[PDB]
Amino acid sequence: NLYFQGMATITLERDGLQLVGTREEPFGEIYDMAIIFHGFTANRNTSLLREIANSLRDENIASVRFDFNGHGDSDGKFENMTVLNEIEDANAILNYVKTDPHVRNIYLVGHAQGGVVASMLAGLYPDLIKKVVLLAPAATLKGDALEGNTQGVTYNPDHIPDRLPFKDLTLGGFYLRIAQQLPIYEVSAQFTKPVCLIHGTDDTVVSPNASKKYDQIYQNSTLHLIEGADHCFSDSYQKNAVNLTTDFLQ
């Protein structure tokens, strides 16, 4: 604001769970604010999200970034996380942002599964959200779950198990049952204001086809396929994601 600029930790509550977040506060009495959502098994402080928040702050756009339930410093077992309860987390975050007297326009920025959270939240609040940026939005998590193949781990999609060991973690069967019937594009398409879609051509985790499909469904979208970039826009590719996001939001 006019007096404090910098970072601050903030905590919010959603159903008895504490969500831990970082606010980047810019100069100015009035500013726009982005809510930035991390991906599946990630957290609020990846290099990609920190560099996005820093870049927005340099253009006087505030941001908040929270750990979802089951991730980072927030409460809840990973096994009990779904995309649905992350959308519930995102709504709790939005409640906090929309009541802040400094905030002019609200933007959503979401990476990978956080992009599905962002796109569906904007579709639920198309009257409120002003712009959305999706980075490799993981809409394929639905098709994956219907196929019975989630990042190399296979199961019977007709009889999903109670829980699914997944790397060092345990993925909830209810995550997958939700994923199969999530109305990702139906809800997302209700947002008719500007959307920026950014996807790397060498993304091996989520096909760039997800972003091509969003670009089809959205009334006002711009698609940027980043030649050579991977799922996390790592290393040499990271500034493509940071620049496009910053330029789009202003």
Ligand X SMILES: COc1cc(/C=C/C(=O)O)ccc1O
The residues of the shown chain that bind ligand X, judged by CB under 6 A, are 39-40, 112-113, 138, 140-141, 144, 150-151, 205-206
Contact between residue 128 and residue 91 where contact means Cβ atoms under 8 Å apart:
no
Q: φ and ψ at 81, to 5 degrees?
A: -80, 140
**For residues 8 and 64, what is the distance between their CA atoms, to the nearest angstrom?**
10
Whichever of 133 and 141 has its CB closer to ligand X, that residue is 141
Find the binder of Na ion among 51, 178, 230, 243 (CB under 5 A): 230
Find the binder of its own copies among 6, 16, 101, 152 (CB under 8 A): 16
Q: How far is the CB of 23 from Cl ion (least distance, A)?
A: 9
99 binds Cl ion (CB under 5 A): no
**Which amino acid would we find at residue 78?**
F
Chain positions 103 to 132 lying near Cl ion, rule: CB under 5 A, are 111
Q: How far is the CB of 113 from ligand X (least distance, A)?
A: 3
124 binds, among Cl ion, Na ion, its own copies, none (CB under 5 to 8 A by kind): its own copies
204 binds, among its own copies, ligand X, Na ion, none (CB under 5 to 8 A by kind): Na ion
Q: How far is the CB of 224 from ligand X (least distance, A)?
A: 18
- Output the six-digit token pair for 79: 């096994």
Burial label for 195, CB within 10 Å (0-12, 13-18, 19+), is buried
Q: What is the DSSP letter of 68?
A: P
Q: φ and ψ at 121, to 5 degrees?
A: -65, -45
Helices (H), 127-228: 140-147, 173-180, 184-188, 209-217
**For residues 26 and 49, what is the distance between their CA atoms, to the nearest angstrom?**
16
Other C-beta atoms within 10 Å of 101: how many?
Answer: 7
99 binds Na ion (CB under 5 A): no
Contact between residue 122 and residue 129 where contact means Cβ atoms under 8 Å apart:
yes
Whichever of 99 and 204 has its CB closer to its own copies, that residue is 99
Whichever of 47 and 219 has its CB closer to ligand X, that residue is 47
Which candidate, 135, 123, 94, 110, places its Cα nearest to that of 182? Answer: 123
| Contact footprint for Cl ion (CB under 5 A) | 1-2, 10-11, 26-27, 29, 38-39, 42, 46-47, 50, 60, 111, 185, 226-227
| Contact footprint for its own copies (CB under 8 A) | 14-17, 69, 75-76, 80, 84-85, 88, 91, 95, 98, 123-125, 127, 158-159, 162, 174, 177-178, 181, 183, 186-187, 190
| Contact footprint for Na ion (CB under 5 A) | 104, 204, 230-231
